[PDB]
């Protein structure tokens, strides 16, 4: 019953190929609901989930006004960080930002987040107190000093404790049929000989939401962490996720192995084995 | 809804 909202911003310079592209996407948990792309033929905030479509023109214009302003600001920020690292005008660079609020199962604010990165490295993050900053290096210390002067932390705390949580709760209600519905994994075990002496057992989980899941293999009831091949959880494209875990076992010790599945959608954790 | 204040880094 825990929920979160996040916005993800990506600003990317591209010397010789026009001004830096800014893209913003918004999520509630693992469901994207809005996008804005400065490279679109006619840049505007666009809906990406059915339950946001009910918001009226003033919502779409407010979002668009904010993201357009961010497009210009991030372009200045990219020029500034270039300078802070004494970098040439020839290279492409990226600023990323991810911020938002986490609610507990009672709908109360658990914590807020606001983190930025430059070229994929931690640059500056708002501390959990929503009042002070952690800067990665002497370049980010400059940003920190600027942000302290414009009272940014104070502004973010007001948003994170206020509008962020209020809007997240609104979205949760408007999208309750999907956002507050956990779909359990559909599970099975496959067996494929690799040779005369060994076979792969692969434990599948399909059609689950949200993406959070634990899939493990045990041998005689102990975890097989080092010997388990475990793919990244992957989107199916219909809101659901997929995952598998594989172990190569001696033929025919198959029955000594059990696949264990934990997911929010499951009223009981699952133990599965290969069924010949 | 997104945060409404821009601030240059």
């Amino acid at each position: 019953g825990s929920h979160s909202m996040r916005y993800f911003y990506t600003a990317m310079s591209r010397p010789g190929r026009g001004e830096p592209r800014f893209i913003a996407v918004g999520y509630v948990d693992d469901t994207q609901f809005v996008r804005f792309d400065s490279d679109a033929a006619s840049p505007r905030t666009e809906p990406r989930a059915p339950w946001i479509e009910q918001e009226g023109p003033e919502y779409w214009d407010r979002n668009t006004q904010i993201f357009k302003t961010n497009t210009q600001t991030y372009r200045e920020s990219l020029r500034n960080l270039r300078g802070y690292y004494n970098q040439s005008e020839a290279g492409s660079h990226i600023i990323q930002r991810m911020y938002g609020c986490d609610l507990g199962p009672d709908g109360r604010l658990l914590r807020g987040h606001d983190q930025s990165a430059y070229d994929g490295k931690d640059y500056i993050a708002l501390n959990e107190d929503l009042s002070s900053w952690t800067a990665a290096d002497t370049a980010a210390q400059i940003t920190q000093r600027k942000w302290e002067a414009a009272r940014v932390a104070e502004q973010l705390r007001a948003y994170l404790e206020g509008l962020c949580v209020e809007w997240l709760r609104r979205y949760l209600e408007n999208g309750k049929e999907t956002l507050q519905r956990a779909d359990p994994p559909k599970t099975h075990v496959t067996h494929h000989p690799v040779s005369d002496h060994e076979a792969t057992l692969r434990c599948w989980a399909l059609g689950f939401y949200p993406a959070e899941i634990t899939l493990t293999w045990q041998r005689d009831g102990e975890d097989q962490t080092q010997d388990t091949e475990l793919v990244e959880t992957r989107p199916a494209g219909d809101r659901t996720f997929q995952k598998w875990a594989a172990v190569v076992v001696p033929s025919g010790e198959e029955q000594r192995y059990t696949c264990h599945v934990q997911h929010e959608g499951l009223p009981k954790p699952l133990t599965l084995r290969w069924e010949p | 809804l997104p945060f409404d204040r821009t601030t240059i880094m």
């Binding site: 990506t10 990317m12 792309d37 492409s92 990226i94 990323q96 793919v231 494209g237 997929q242 | -």
Partner: protein
């Protein structure tokens, strides 16, 4: 400058069944920077109508994208994903395997 090479998975939306329409996915993730080229292939030829997700990223700042197109699997048609990124010397081809 620190760069990260993409992880690539090629798979179907629904369990594969010959002669039944489905979706072919190519999920690229864990890469940095964000510029990437992804094609879906049918018997080695680039499929035309491919759609993809909006650019987003994980808690470690690495990017991910899903590329997808409608397809009808058969016994003999071979599908694949072809991926290029700054981290790769040449395009990497990952074949579609229904048990993966």
């Amino acid at each position: 400058m620190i760069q990260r090479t993409p992880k690539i998975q090629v798979y179907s939306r629904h369990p594969a069944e010959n002669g039944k329409s489905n979706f072919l996915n190519c999920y690229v993730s864990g890469f940095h920077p964000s510029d990437i080229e992804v094609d879906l292939l049918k018997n080695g030829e680039r499929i035309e109508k491919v759609e993809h997700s909006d650019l987003s990223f994980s808690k470690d700042w690495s990017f991910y994208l899903l590329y997808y197109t409608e397809f009808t699997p058969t016994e003999k048609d071979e599908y694949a994903c072809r991926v290029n990124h700054v981290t790769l010397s040449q395009p990497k081809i990952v074949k579609w395997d229904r048990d993966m």
